[model samples]
Target chain A: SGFRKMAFPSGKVEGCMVQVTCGTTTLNGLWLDDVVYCPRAVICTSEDMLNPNYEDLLIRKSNHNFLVQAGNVQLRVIGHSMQNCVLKLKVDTANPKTPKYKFVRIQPGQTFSVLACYNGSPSGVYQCAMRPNFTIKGSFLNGSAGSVGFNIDYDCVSFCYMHHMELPTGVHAGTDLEGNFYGPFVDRQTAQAAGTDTTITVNVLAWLYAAVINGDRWFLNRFTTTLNDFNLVAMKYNYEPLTQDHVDILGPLSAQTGIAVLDMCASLKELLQNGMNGRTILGSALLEDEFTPFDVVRQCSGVTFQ
Target chain B: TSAVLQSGFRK
Candidate 1:
């Protein structure tokens, strides 16, 4: 029938106090028979957990799921412990309108996904905390600590702009070995075989430009998309414009035919796919791994193009 | 005119 004393960090002896101060936590008020005798005996949550910034405090492997001050962020918890761990989203009413604390109790071996969108907050704190057993661990200013229970992964859906444009249609689209398609042609023999009229004409440069534009569109319509209406922003292929080497290759072969069609699918698809997989899109050039982010430019709310 | 422009890029 006695009030329990708060847990304190112990020394190797198991009964003796290691130090007067908790490592990264605060001292809670002491409990002696439920009446306060001393206040600094119990150690509790640290102050940083109350007002967190862009600091990495997640337990090791879950470090990647750090705080994103704004925008759309997805938080995933991969549990490993046999006991259920609690995930708490702490939102201050002063910051904006939302529940003060949202609790998600995750089962052992279960994975949970939390999608959060934060508006601008002045004097407001948006933080996440994981509580297991009697201990609390916080991320950013929200702090929690545990040996092993769960891992976290989080990422903000970053975006970029693509000026509105249309795809060209002079040459028929062709597919690469991997089945990605691109457009524009430079050899008439193949064009006429597909029943394409040789009369419709475009210069090599315009044709190549159109080919790249079509390739960019193809990539957006593929991999990176949400609900098929909202597309995730992806890097457009850096399809360089016509060069002398290109002319040298196409000139003589197409000169023999009235109108020539050269399909540029293979190279374009290779570049776009490699970039999407996070490899170096531009390899060994002065700019290695450089990418240009592009939006699919679809009809949606909150997407703006200039 | 490109073949796609006169007809359409994708039906």
Candidate 2:
């Protein structure tokens, strides 16, 4: 068994520096220059060369040179040694639709930037990728170079001035037990005055008072009472003897309000059986009475609320 | 406003 050792230099040259270094260096020195002559020998000195710190590397010498126009831009790797190098550039924008730039064949030691002209907002992300072509004379160091990427942000002038304010919170309109439009129910007066017909109106007022006292209990009990519970309650009340005073107070009121009371009772009974309440009854009645008129008006006006 | 505009351009 035997082992061998190999060593390679990591450095880059670009622009006038390339011409000067290549021109001034002895043939031996230039020939020894891995990046200049043998592109494959130019090892990646920095672990993340593509995203080398611009400040530390002095890669961005001046901001004056960076320019953006109005369309898509491309940073192409152009040189003979490019075939042996792997370079990838990515242009990302807050707006995903913005065009991206990428390159695979980048000359060793060469770097460039591409600017995309944006007519609209300028907020975006930019990144670059580069991987070295690895080779070895002995053991190891022959695998593909690791990839590197970086991000840059850009924004338009108005970006800072734009403020997104919190939207106001609103209360949703309330619905009755049957999902019908009762009065807004914001106040007692409105709740009491909702119905039109005299007897129905009085019943409505009474229900409203009961609702106020019970706090939605009337609705729940009316609609949710079981048949067994109703029967038991009817039996309990049937056997109970009403006092003379009870008859005096309730008799006249019952006489004047008998039909309304019966209607309410029947409604309550129906509600108990199938969870139908005044609101549901009202809703059904409203739909039956006005749906045709509503459709007709909408059709004539060529307007649909949906 | 001018400063904001300048900052935007710088960005």
Candidate 3:
């Protein structure tokens, strides 16, 4: 009854995977370093991932399982012919809290996922269990027994920088230059702030999806101008330029969604240069007499240029 | 009996 320390390869933090196998009576546990503070992570079944290259995720000989998911990735619990087990994750390292994410009865062909970082810092502990009885909500019996295990191909991604933002939902909440906190937005379309807050946080993946995959001009122009009274949303990570890690993480998404980034930057630059009127600045609904300046768009999009 | 989780074993 012991847990093993899984370390990331030297200078590599993304696209890492680990498998937690079942014991005769109970399943094993695994731990990784500095995962709690990680801005984002993608944990899915190895088979579900678009990337074919894998080194550590699979150790045993087994058939592949599939569950395609996006937006704050989590574990994909694939069960065998026997009873599926419970997976628990506790994030507090110096201290310990109850694993906020829990799967009581993970059935065969079923997959589950949870956010890796909430308030952000160190990696957590992942454990598996076979209880005396099976239950969905509280306690129920499935009458099945044997062993259940799962494979998790996870990346301790640092490419996406969430500045004072939380996850599990698509809404992006962050503080602006004024120190006023904003957001908990409903979605990308309804990202309006309630206070004198002018900055809205945009999901990087959502921006990439809209700009590069869907080729949406309307979505592209949303960040082009600042709103008067209404809040202005920041569509990119600020305080830094694009890094190799950013490209590395985004490439996997691009491979699946058919998209790119540097080109995206160029496209937005061109749109800014030509300029769109305030009526067409964000969408058809909002009307303004002045030509919308692209200052906020450039200010917020600091991460993309390099 | 105390039940515990185990690792580094082959199935």
User: Which model scores highest in lDDT?
Assistant: 3
TM-score between candidate 2 chain A and the true chain A: 0.14
The candidate, 2 or 3, that scores higher on TM-score is 3
Please identify model 2 stretches exceeding 4 Å from their true place: A1-250, A258-264, A277-306, B1-11
Which is the leading candidate under DockQ?
A: 3
Candidate 2 interface RMSD (Å): 30.5
Q: What's the true lDDT of residue A60 in model 2?
A: 24
Off by over 4 Å in 1: A1-86, A89-94, A97-211, A214-265, A269-294, A298-302, B1-11
Which prediction has more favorable DockQ, 1 or 3?
3
lDDT of 3: 0.24
lDDT of 3 by residue, A7-105 (tens): 212122122222333221111122233122110111213232233122233333232231211123433433322111212232223212212221132
* Cα lDDT tens digits for candidate 1, A182-282: 22322111222122221101121222333233332232222222211111111222233333444444443234322232333233333334544543211
The local lDDT score (0 to 100) that residue A258 gets in candidate 3 is: 49
Model 2 CAPRI rating: incorrect
Q: A113-227, model 2: which lDDT tens digit per residue?
A: 2111112122222211110111001111111111111111121110000000011121111111121222222111111221211111222323322332323333323333333
Question: Using Cα atoms with residue i matched to residue i, what is each candidate's TM-score against the true structure?
Answer: 0.17, 0.14, 0.22
